[PDB]
């Protein structure tokens, strides 16, 4: 059909929805505002936030959503409603460590902000990286349903983002998950949609 | 099939599984843990958070994955892919408006804390509830599909922890979104678990 996605110039929560794209190999309008465009695209998005993927002329929004909704129609779901559970457990599990990063990165106020650093960097940080690392390990490379999922997609989309916010490379000290990393950047779709794509830090 | 929720002594989170698993007709233990016992339930818990259900015994967690899968046994899920993206839409962008109250309620800094209050009661809530508003009258009275999904039953069974954060009623004055709670809340599965919950402020 005919895909068109909005979003920052960037990667962040618009990588997973060009890395599927790419995979399941649907051409798509990869439209990136300016930073001066947004004022003016803000009041036609669903909730005034994107990526926003329009797919026949029908807007889709939420990163995450639009993810399972495509790892569906890419063959990357579970084979049953039990391993679509697995998948979606993981990922909302993906959402609250972004949070708890973006919970410091986004903060305004640089007394409070600074008050955070240490407990993300010596609790949260190390929480997460392992017990993902775990689950890895336990599917067998995966992040879940002991197969290749839109998850491992969408978290591998993210990583840069994640690292960037975090100041660090998330699972350079987590075997499992930098094989996992490897892997899926690995996969020709990506690789070749990688060498294409625009360079930014986030 | 055996269910067993593990969450806090309040609604928030736990509520819409406790809402669908009463819409499903089926029982389940109800297991609420004390304060000072949470520092040892923590570590056997997938990712160290509830809510977490036991499927006859299978672990589950995140509040939003557990709700969907339920909302498919139950015949409160969409017909086809579209109509599941659309509900899932939905949801995550409750998640987002959770958030945002979130950001303000647990600021644990008086002088960021009042920073956020304005903006929040000013722009951010009659922002969400407004677009919340024209999405349930868009849809005959419900928040997708033009049907009853566990969306609704997600969304009414936090509300009162969102009023709470937000400190008043968000839907008083969003005529179909107080419609939409009195139809859900009105559901005899919902009333009787009404009836017999313990009561809570959120």
Known sequence: PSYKLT????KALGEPIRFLLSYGEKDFEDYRFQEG?????????????????????????????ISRYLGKQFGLSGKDDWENLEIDMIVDTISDFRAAIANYHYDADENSKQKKWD????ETIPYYTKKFDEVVKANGGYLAAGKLTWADF?????????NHMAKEDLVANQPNLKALREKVL???????????????DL
Not at 119 to 122: G, R, S
Not at 154 to 162: G, K, P, Q
Not at 186 to 200: E, H, Q, S
């Open 119 to 122: 407990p993300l960097k010596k």
């Open 37 to 65: 465009d947004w004022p003016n695209l803000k009041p036609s998005m669903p909730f005034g936030k994107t990526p926003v993927l329009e797919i026949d002329g029908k807007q889709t929004h939420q990163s995450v959503a």
């Open 154 to 162: 969408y978290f591998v989309a993210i990583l840069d983002y994640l």
């Open 186 to 200: 690995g996969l020709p779709a990506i690789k070749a949609w990688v060498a294409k794509r625009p360079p930014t």
């Open 7 to 10: 979003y920052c110039p960037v």
